[PDB]
Amino acid sequence: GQMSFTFASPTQVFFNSANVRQVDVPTQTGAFGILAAHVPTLQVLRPGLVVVHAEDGTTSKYFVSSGSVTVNADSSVQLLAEEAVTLDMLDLGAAKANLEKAQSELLGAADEATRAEIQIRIEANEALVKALE
Amino acid sequence: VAYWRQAGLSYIRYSQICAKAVRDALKTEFKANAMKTSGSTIKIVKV
Amino acid sequence: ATLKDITRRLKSIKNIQKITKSMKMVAAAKYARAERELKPARVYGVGSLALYEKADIKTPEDKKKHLIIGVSSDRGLCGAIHSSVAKQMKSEAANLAAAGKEVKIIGVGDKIRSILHRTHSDQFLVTFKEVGRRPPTFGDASVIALELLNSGYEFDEGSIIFNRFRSVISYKTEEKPIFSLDTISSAESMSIYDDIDADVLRNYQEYSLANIIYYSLKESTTSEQSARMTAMDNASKNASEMIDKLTLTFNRTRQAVITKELIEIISGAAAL
Amino acid sequence: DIDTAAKFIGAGAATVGVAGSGAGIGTVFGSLIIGYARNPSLKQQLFSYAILGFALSEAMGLFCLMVAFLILFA
Amino acid sequence: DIDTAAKFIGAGAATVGVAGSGAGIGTVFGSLIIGYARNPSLKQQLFSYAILGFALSEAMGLFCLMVAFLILFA
Amino acid sequence: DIDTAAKFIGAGAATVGVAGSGAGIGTVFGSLIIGYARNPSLKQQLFSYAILGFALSEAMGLFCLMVAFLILFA
Amino acid sequence: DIDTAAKFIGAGAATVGVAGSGAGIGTVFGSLIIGYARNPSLKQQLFSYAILGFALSEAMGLFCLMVAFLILFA
Amino acid sequence: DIDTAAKFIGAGAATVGVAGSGAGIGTVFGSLIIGYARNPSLKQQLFSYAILGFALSEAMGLFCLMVAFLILFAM
Amino acid sequence: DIDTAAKFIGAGAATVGVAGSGAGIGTVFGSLIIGYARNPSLKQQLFSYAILGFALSEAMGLFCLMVAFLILFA
Amino acid sequence: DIDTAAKFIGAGAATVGVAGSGAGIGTVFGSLIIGYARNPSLKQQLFSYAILGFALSEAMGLFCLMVAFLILFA
Amino acid sequence: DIDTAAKFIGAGAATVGVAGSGAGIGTVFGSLIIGYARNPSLKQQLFSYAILGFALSEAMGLFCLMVAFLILFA
């Protein structure tokens, strides 16, 4: 009962068929933890922070913006994020400024597509702020 | 469904917007690395 | 020929050797960067494919719509990159057209649209330019995937054909299938996959599409950078070899003309 | 008298109502947990909905008790 | 008077019903939480459904209590 | 005079049977909220099934009250 | 007469057993809503199963009311 | 006779045990519907469990009626 | 003799606690179906847990039945 | 006397109110199990809410028992 | 005697409390099945919580049966 964890942005890689114990992810339907024999699923991420615990009790947290997570029959997890950055790689002040900016533009409902785009940006910045704080 | 799918988007655009948000919210030093790799250059040809 | 012709030809071929040496070096640098950047993209692409690899999906044989994507570049002198890609594209296209399937073709690169211009003229759904000029990012793959989804063709099955980079000298043209959620949902192997609406599945399919297109783009870029490196190497070597004989011809013709001039001078002096 | 007997029989039968309360509110605090497990970030609003549900469900157990005491004294 | 005692016992029993409606409201406000957590974008519509469910389920507790009062005072 | 008392008690006991209808309404309208927030683009069909469930689960409550009245006034 | 008085109280207490049928119908038609929201394609077979469960949960409530009418009239 | 009279209210009280039994039948079949919507390929096996399920949920509940009839007839 | 009648009515009232255990068995075997449908690869362990829960649910469904038979024949 | 006999009736009939609290505790701990299987990294907060729900819904059974006692000994 | 009859009635009624614990045990061991279908690796802690919930929802039905026996004896 071991897990084969794969986790990579298109540009870099973080875990390559490693052996972790638990992985907590956001999934556009909730926010769940994957363990050595989780039931197979497919999900798509929302801007959040995936937390990984290795065999020894150390926690590494990476903010993912979007992507997919696959939990398979053989307990091999594949977590592909379009943009993953460690929390030390993020400006709190800049994130808060961007969040307030997007909230300010929310008034300008230029159309359904642009309204949705601004709302998505607000949600992403909200997750950024909540993770950094 | 989601509040963006009902707006006629797709998950590709959603991921693009989220990645843009994150990359625009990086440290002043990592911003350079983030921007250069994520640029787009492909152009259409009408059929 | 006269000495002037040999002079001009040797000038031109020396110039050619210089330029091809330059191209070989610049292509080697570009290939080095691309190979460095392809290490993580390979892991990313394999992760993307994992689901389809070990959750066996097969499109049932009663679906009309097929798609062909061919990955290539614009810059020429890449060797048999574009040739092999387009040849495989049309082979599969005709194969599928035998079974009465409404095939469509998408080409990522100018060379593919050019080569397949005569045949398959109308089957093109869209093609993309400005490829290879700079390394293909994920934004490029997202643009291609978007422009595929939006185009009024809901394919049932698809295949993407690219050049898997094996080594500096060897690359193998490869095909990878891609499915549609109309087929994902009704696959028996997917029953075990818990928490799968008919909606998270379309988001997942869109992301997988972008993923596989990005992976094929990165493989293609590495493969053709290596191919151009080797082609320029061969061209430069052959140019130097030609210079080897051409300089001998230069020297021999110069000596022969000098001797003839001296002989005619002495003949004129003797006659007077 | 038989009236002072009903005082207690009916009063006891009228506190059977409180069971509803005990059931209902449990479900609330069940769902909250489940909800908080799917979406921890909404902790605050989830708890707001939960306190609404508790107040507005145990009110009916309180009506049961009020009826019981009303019978006991009227 | 036996009639008074029977009236009081009858009201005590008839008020037992409101336990069911208390449980029903508990379920409604649990499902509201779960639905909200899974889809926080619909808070308005979800709460509208919750209002209808609560009102239309406490209707039955009011049925029970008016029955008890018809036994007692009328 | 004993028979009047027994009729009162029997009706008051019969009227307890709408607790089931209260709980059933709670469950159906909680499922409506969950199954709407889970798939908002079927609002109409989900609400139609909710209304059918209400009707079928309230037939029982109105039957309990009907038999209660039949006991009281017959 | 204690005979008819006892009969009335007995029938009144017996008829409360359809609270079970009410709650069961509620659960069946909440589950149908949830399932249909999850897999809108299966709607036909889903409604078939929902009706089957409805009938089997109706059986016991109708049987309880049968016992109640029986005792009240025998 | 009080003994004959009280038997009737005893039978009426005992016949209320079918309530929880019917509620259990309802939840068994609700779970059947949800499970079938989750995995419509095991359609048969699931039903089998459901059968078992309500049988027990009914069978044990049926005991109440046994008692009730006893109270009415076999003292 | 009221004792010879108190026994009968007390038994008829004590045998009401079987409703809760009927509902509990229904819930355990509904959870079994959902859980087996979700993750069929491990169905034996799910069945084992279902049998354990069912055993306990009857345990309490039959304690009250035992007390009923006790106050009826002792 | 009728008075003490009715007192025992009421004491016995007021404890059933603890059934609701029992079912509530069952559902809250079931939801704790579910929400800990989903997100096993919130264990501490989830058990905090679970114990809050248990205490605050065991209060109902406590209330029913204290009424069922004060009915006898006061 | 009337007091003996009252003993019998009170014990028989107070026994009905354990329906709550029966339903609660059913709910806990259905939730254990589902939450195990999700994360098998948590088996140990899931069963620890399930047994905690079983015992600490048993307590309520056991109190009801204890008080029924107390009335039936002392």
Show the tokens assigned to C85: 């890609």
Please, are residues E65 and F5 in contact by the beta-carbon 8 Å criterion? no
Distance from CA of I59 to the nearest CA of K (A): 8
Please, are residues E39 and F34 in contact by the beta-carbon 8 Å criterion? no
Q: How far apart (Å, rounded) are the C-alpha atoms in residues E45 and C106?
A: 44
Please, are residues K57 and K24 in contact by the beta-carbon 8 Å criterion? yes
Q: How far apart (Å, rounded) are the C-alpha atoms in residues C183 and J50?
A: 43
Nearest CA in chain I to K27: I27
The beta-strand segments (E) located in chain B are: 43-45
Q: How far apart (Å, rounded) are the C-alpha atoms in residues C98 and E35?
A: 51
Question: Which residue type, as a one-letter code, is found at position C47?
Answer: G
Strand partners, A32: A25
Q: How far apart (Å, rounded) are the C-alpha atoms in residues A32 and A23?
A: 8
∠ CA D18-H17-I9, rounded to 5°: 85
Name chain E contacts of D27, Cβ cutoff 8 Å.
23, 26-27, 29-30
Q: Per the structure, how many domains does chain B have?
A: 1
> Is B40 part of the contact surface with chain A (CB cutoff 8 Å)?
no
> Is B1 part of the contact surface with chain F (CB cutoff 8 Å)?
yes
CA distance readout (Å), C246 to C12, C243, C249, C251, G55:
11, 5, 5, 9, 100
Quick count: other Cβ atoms within 10 Å of Cβ C5? 11
> Is A40 part of the contact surface with chain K (CB cutoff 8 Å)?
no
**Percent of chain K as helix, strand, coil, to the nearest 5:** 95, 0, 5
Q: Mutate which of C184, C193, C194, C197 to disrupt the G interface (most G C-beta within 10 Å)?
A: C197
Q: How far apart (Å, rounded) are the C-alpha atoms in residues D23 and J21?
A: 6
**Percent of chain G as helix, strand, coil, to the nearest 5:** 95, 0, 5
∠ CA K12-K17-K19, rounded to 5°: 110
Q: What is the DSSP string of C70-113?
A: EE--S-S---SHHHHHHHHHHHHHHHHHHTT-EEEEEEESHHHH
User: Which 3 state secondary structure label does DSSP give A6?
Assistant: strand
Strands across the sheet containing A41-44: A13-18, A4-8, A76-81, A67-71, A41-44
Cα radius of gyration rounded to whole Å, chain H:
18
Q: How far apart (Å, rounded) are the C-alpha atoms in residues A53 and A88?
A: 18
> Is A8 part of the contact surface with chain D (CB cutoff 8 Å)?
no
Q: Which of J35, J56, J60 sits opposite D18 (nearest CB)?
A: J60
Neighbours, chain G (3 or more CB pairs < 8 A) = C, F, H, I
Q: How far apart (Å, rounded) are the C-alpha atoms in residues H47 and A71?
A: 28
Please, are residues D19 and J64 in contact by the beta-carbon 8 Å criterion? yes
Show the tokens assigned to B23: 């990359």
Show the tokens assigned to C262: 């001296």
Q: Per the structure, how many domains does chain I have?
A: 1
* CB atoms I41 and C194 under 8 Å: no
Please, are residues C55 and C189 in contact by the beta-carbon 8 Å criterion? yes
Show the tokens assigned to C27: 């292509």
Please, are residues C170 and C227 in contact by the beta-carbon 8 Å criterion? no
Q: What is the DSSP string of K14-33?
A: HGGGHHHHHHHHHHHHHHHH
Please, are residues D31 and E30 in contact by the beta-carbon 8 Å criterion? yes
Please, are residues A40 and A32 in contact by the beta-carbon 8 Å criterion? no
Closest CA to G65 of I26, H18, F25: H18
Strand pairing report for C65-71 and C157-165: parallel
- Indicate the helix (H) or strand (E) that contains H17: none
CA distance readout (Å), K29 to I25, I28, I31, I69, K32:
10, 6, 8, 28, 5
CA distance readout (Å), C181 to B12, C204, G39, H58:
15, 9, 15, 42
φ/ψ of G65, rounded to 5, equals: -65, -30
Name chain J contacts of I20, Cβ cutoff 8 Å.
19, 22-23
Show the tokens assigned to H16: 């209320």
Q: How far apart (Å, rounded) are the C-alpha atoms in residues F28 and G33?
A: 8
The resolution in angstroms reads 3.5
Chain center to CA of H41:
29
The experimental method is cryo-EM
Domain of residue F57, residue span:
1-74
* CB atoms A30 and D41 under 8 Å: no
Specify the DSSP class assigned to residue C194: B
Q: What is the DSSP string of A41-55?
A: EEEE--SEEEEEEES
Strand partners, C66: C103, C157
Q: How far apart (Å, rounded) are the C-alpha atoms in residues E72 and D74?
A: 10
Closest CA to J25 of J46, J49, J55: J55
Q: How far apart (Å, rounded) are the C-alpha atoms in residues I32 and H31?
A: 8
* CB atoms I41 and C192 under 8 Å: yes
Please, are residues E70 and E16 in contact by the beta-carbon 8 Å criterion? no
Specify the DSSP class assigned to residue E54: H
Strand partners, C160: C69, C176
Give the CATH number of the domain where residue K48 resides. 1.20.20.10
Residue found by looking up tokens 């829960």 in the block: I53
Question: Which residue type, as a one-letter code, is found at position B43?
Answer: K
* CB atoms A130 and D41 under 8 Å: yes
CA distance readout (Å), A74 to B28, C197, F59, H57:
42, 22, 50, 37
Q: How far apart (Å, rounded) are the C-alpha atoms in residues C11 and H39?
A: 76
Distance from CA of A26 to the nearest CA of K (A): 16
Distance from CA of E35 to the nearest CA of D (A): 8
Distance from CA of A130 to the nearest CA of D (A): 8
Specify the DSSP class assigned to residue C244: H
Closest CA to C148 of C119, C113, C100, C106: C106
Please, are residues G70 and G7 in contact by the beta-carbon 8 Å criterion? no
D interface with J, Cβ–Cβ < 8 A, is 1-2, 4-13, 15-34, 36-38, 40, 54, 58, 61, 65, 68
- Indicate the helix (H) or strand (E) that contains E5: helix E2-14
Q: Mutate which of D33, D34, D38 to disrupt the A interface (most A C-beta within 10 Å)?
A: D38
User: Which 3 state secondary structure label does DSSP give F40?
Assistant: helix
Spell out the residues 6+ positions from residue E12 whose beta carbon is closer than 8 angstroms to its own.
D6, D9, D10, D11, D12, D13, D14, D67, D68, D71, E68, F12
User: Which 3 state secondary structure label does DSSP give D74?
Assistant: coil
> Is C198 part of the contact surface with chain A (CB cutoff 8 Å)?
no
Q: How far apart (Å, rounded) are the C-alpha atoms in residues J19 and J4?
A: 25
Closest CA to F50 of F65, F33, F64: F33
Quick count: other Cβ atoms within 10 Å of Cβ G48? 12
Q: How far apart (Å, rounded) are the C-alpha atoms in residues F13 and C9?
A: 117
User: Which 3 state secondary structure label does DSSP give I26?
Assistant: helix
CA distance readout (Å), A37 to C108, C196, E11, E44, J16:
41, 18, 56, 38, 43
User: Which 3 state secondary structure label does DSSP give C120?
Assistant: coil
Quick count: other Cβ atoms within 10 Å of Cβ E42? 18
Strand pairing report for C65-71 and C102-108: parallel
Q: How far apart (Å, rounded) are the C-alpha atoms in residues C127 and C144?
A: 9
Distance from CA of A51 to the nearest CA of J (A): 10
Neighbours, chain A (3 or more CB pairs < 8 A) = B, C, D, E, I, J, K
Q: Which of C47, C196, C203 sits opposite A6 (nearest CB)?
A: C47
Quick count: other Cβ atoms within 10 Å of Cβ D24? 38
Show the tokens assigned to C145: 């995937």
Distance from CA of C154 to the nearest CA of G (A): 20
Cβ pairs D/K, distance under 8 A: 3
Please, are residues A9 and A81 in contact by the beta-carbon 8 Å criterion? yes
D with H: touching (≥3 Cβ pairs within 8 Å): no
**Percent of chain E as helix, strand, coil, to the nearest 5:** 95, 0, 5
